[PDB]
């Protein structure tokens, strides 16, 4: 509601202190807007580690999915925020969550050749054989984006 | 022996009036220039015989309806005069293979960018995601433009094959709509993915985009010559250039051609023809009105080459030439409604790209296929 929007905005803008005040005024940690985007999605996308931690501590749903099927973990991998990816995984994030097109966080990290994120993901059980709507795997995504390096590594199919 | 003219209030009617001043000083024909609001919505009501202006100035798209109900006279410029104008501009004033008005100015969207934030703007849409991540790290946004009107998102959607109505030598096939094809779907899906990945927000409108760019918050925006003055006031170091390509194909923005039509019920058609071809459609003629209010790119090759020295005008003309002339047929009205709904629903996930475009296709008067 009132505090609902405020929390999303603060989380997006990395206003750590604003988040503190809002939570104290009864703001819902799991407030979701029109598209199903939660404060956790926005902090995971913007790369605000301290805020991600705070929301998780207050009970933020680690696997909330928006209208496109994205979980905070998808946004973290796509935006290259390794620290946030780790925290999410430690709080129970589904390493193999799939969006509406069947893409997993591994597919997204693959599009950019994020080696460290790929490792943390694999370690947590990411299915390297997972296929999306276009029948593509993380490997196929690496070639389509010209990430020869990551491509050669994902060779462990 | 009197020529009455109707022109919008945002145009240079003072300069145009100055033009009719010379005509009157060589023939004695009293030239009157008026600019009543709702003139375009009023013309078909007042011009329906009885009496209305002799010459009406307006975007060519509105002239299709006028010709539909026989409200405009068929003009017949000679092969010599026709060569003074860019060929594609004559295609915007055609109705059933019959010229119904004279091309005056040309407008189309261009890519506007902050030179300080972005030295060399992207030549392709595909590069934008990477560019946005690079800029987001420096506290900046790559691109921000009005996503609420299909007029602004069409350039991308049409790039790989999409189109409104098929145009074939002087005519539109009103039943052949191109919003449901593979090209349109490819473009709209690329746009949705930008929103899905947070490179853009589905709620960004005209005002939000404008303020963000003029405040140096975003590296680029998409807009026409009408937005230039406000950017000058913001003092942002900006450039205007060709729109990015999508799948190697140029973005195809809608082209609008300010045109002057003659009232089919006008008793003095020869005069009107004389005025337009020999007094307005000349280097001095257009320059007279341009000084009172900039026209942007121009249909008259002659004066266009002089104006094209301004790189912004050269970009406008380059984008227009690569664009899609806005269809002047009545069906466009439903097209706008249908497509606006499709993009908004696709962008918010309320509908899938396929679903959304399938609805837009039939809503525009086309067949699924």
From Swiss-Prot, chain B:
Cellular localization per UniProt: Periplasm
Alphabetized Pfam families for the sequence: SBP_bac_1
SUPFAM superfamilies: Periplasmic binding protein-like II (SSF53850)
Primary subcellular site in the record, as a coarse category: periplasm
GO CC term (a single one): outer membrane-bounded periplasmic space
Residue pairs linked by disulfide bridges in the UniProt entry: none
One Gene Ontology biological process: maltose transport
Superkingdom field: Bacteria
InterPro entries assigned to the protein according to its UniProt record, in alphabetical order: Maltose/Cyclodextrin-bd, SBP, SBP_1_CS
Keyword hit for Protein biosynthesis: no
Keywords tagged on the record: Periplasm, Signal, Sugar transport, Transport
GO molecular function annotations of the record: carbohydrate transmembrane transporter activity; maltose binding
Subunit structure: The complex is composed of two ATP-binding proteins (MalK), two transmembrane proteins (MalG and MalF) and a solute-binding protein (MalE).
Function: Part of the ABC transporter complex MalEFGK involved in maltose/maltodextrin import. Binds maltose and higher maltodextrins.
Family: Belongs to the bacterial solute-binding protein 1 family.
Protein name, entry field: Maltose/maltodextrin-binding periplasmic protein
Species per Swiss-Prot/TrEMBL record: Escherichia coli O157:H7
